[PDB]
């Protein structure tokens, strides 16, 4: 009923070298040594002990910490050992708490960057002629950038589009109707004459003057950009919005909606 | 530079119904109504306001709470508004805390379940004759259930094995060597005479008497089961372990190493 270094190591999923190591340092020592083979032998009573020694290591308690507990008799006392552990528990809770306080201060600092980014978003003025776009429309005042959801409805189907004048760039078009809903469209510039994939439309973006803003960030943060633009950015440059169609401009600089390194040009029609 | 319900709703990704709603309740009322179309029109100065109303909603602040704030002047006061929010922030921290306190108490209870399960793990005695097993062998006193790792090394290769006498059941065999290492093997019972997939072995489990323990739980918890077995479960039944080969027994009752619903018979050779 005595166990070998190998049976012990097995049931605890450790290597026999560890158990040798523990023997040299007098931490966990075998009840005896094989008198005809020099092997180490352990009693079943030692199992629960190795179990605690190993329980400490899973808590990253350094080995010598452990050895000190062995030496001063605290490892083999359920009360002292418990004390050691609550102390370590306490430290862990604190280190966690401390970092939480940091994530808040960090959360705080990210916001401040947003006002900074928006402060640096300068208008370039430009006129562009009418042009044609084919893709997936959505007529209607809907909540969400369920457009983030539209784009993901549109991406599997993009390949279907013949006649792409420049497949490197795409558009997130929003048109106003006097009725008051917006008509959004995700698409690609295509020459007239090409066929429209089933369930797709062809939209004509009229000739317009624009203020172009380079949104440098995430697609969900696009709405914030629009908000600044319409609350003050235009005015601050004595520009007036014109009723018309605006669009998001996606080219090489765009690398995914959730990717903070994506730029997107915002084409705001003006007077 | 007045915006429509439609441009407003878009740049905030909400539906125009929401803006109608906010107007009827007097919460967010447009600066005017279209006199030739009865439409609603908003000033760019209302953007930041709608912005905060909506920020509250993202905090699940109910709408009526919000309307209360609007009514009692607090909503338009950066100081009162801030106070409202720290209050709410406070509540959230408390609710989180409370639940942590419960996770700990829950952790404690899970542990107590373990001793209970081990107490109910009864030995059934059984003799089985020698039998042959084919699979992937590991020689050597290794740490970790890198046996968890062996099984996942072995599984892509299982299909290769011809002559499987009973593919429903596999074995996790551990054999002891005089030098004290253990020799582990994951495999299937296969009749003699069948060829051995390259890099695989054929191990012979000798005829033995066993105590069988049904481990009901997770493969990582298998080691604890072994620990109970050799520390006292055998003694309590006046059984004595015999030097030999033990094995884990996987049949239908086994549903995967991570599934708390798996059972595994543990075959412990005895006198
Ligand atoms: N070569 C060697 N092996 C060791 C030694 N100490 C432990 N073992 C291994 O541990 C098993 C059981 O050891 P035990 O608890 O002393 O329990 C032992 C022990 O109580 C007794 N026993 C067997 N042979 C001897 C012996 O030569 N001298 C003594 N004093 N007792 C023995 O029978 C039980 C079963 O022994 P086994 O079935 O042979 O299997 C033995 C043996 O494989 C050692 O000093 N030398
Ligand atoms: N009262 C007190 N005395 C301290 C403290 N830190 C160091 N000492 C003293 O300095 C000696 C060596 O510390 P070390 O180089 O960290 O080397 C230490 C340390 O690395 C490790 N150790 C012992 N206890 C603990 C522990 O509770 N936690 C950790 N992380 N390591 C420990 O074992 C080694 C030997 O320690 P000792 O033989 O006890 O001897 C210790 C101890 O007498 C402390 O925080 N409080
Ligand atoms: N049908 C209708 N539409 C409305 C009303 N209120 C706002 N809008 C829409 O909002 C846009 C800008 O309105 P604004 O800021 O008053 O700025 C307006 C306003 O300052 C001026 N304006 C144009 N027509 C009229 C008018 O009939 N009366 C007044 N007082 N001003 C007008 O020209 C600016 C640009 O107007 P638009 O480019 O046409 O585009 C207008 C129009 O499409 C309304 O009561 N009825
Ligand atoms: N001092 C105080 N008075 C309370 C409290 N709970 C209820 N009352 C009183 O009871 C009235 C109706 O509360 P309700 O039916 O929960 O209906 C409430 C509630 O459903 C919601 N609401 C208002 N303020 C808050 C708020 O701060 N937090 C939340 N979660 N909901 C609010 O809107 C309604 C507000 O109506 P009121 O004009 O405030 O009128 C409130 C208020 O005068 C409280 O915790 N503290």
Residue numbers in the entry:
A (entry chain B), B (entry chain A): 0 to 270
Question: What text appears in the publication on this structure?
Answer:
The monomer can be divided into three domains: the N-terminal DNA-binding domain (residues 1–75), which adopts a winged helix-turn-helix fold; the long central α-helical linker (residues 76–119), which connects two terminal domains; and the C-terminal multidrug-binding domain (residues 120–270). Our most striking finding is that BrlR is not only a pyocyanin receptor but it is also a dual receptor that is responsive to both c-di-GMP and pyocyanin.
The structure of the BrlR–c-di-GMP complex belongs to space group I4. Each asymmetric unit contains two BrlR monomers and four c-di-GMP molecules. The DNA-binding domain contains two separate c-di-GMP-binding sites, and shares a mutually intercalated c-di-GMP dimer in a stacking conformation with a crystallographic symmetry related binding site. Thus, the overall structure reveals a receptor–ligand complex with a 1:2 stoichiometry. The structure shows that the 2′-hydroxyl group of the c-di-GMP molecule in each site points toward the solvent and is not involved in the binding to BrlR. Crystallographic symmetry analysis indicates that the BrlR-c-di-GMP complex also forms a stable homotetramer, which is made up of two dimers as the final model of apo-BrlR (AA′ and BB′). Overall, the c-di-GMP-bound BrlR has a larger positively charged surface than apo-BrlR on the DNA-binding domain, and the simultaneous occupation of the two c-di-GMP binding sites twists and bends the DNA-binding domain and the coiled-coil linker. The recognition helix (α2) of the HTH motif is 1.2 Å shorter (Cα(H20)–Cα(H20′)) in the BrlR-c-di-GMP complex than that in apo-BrlR, which could help BrlR approach DNA.
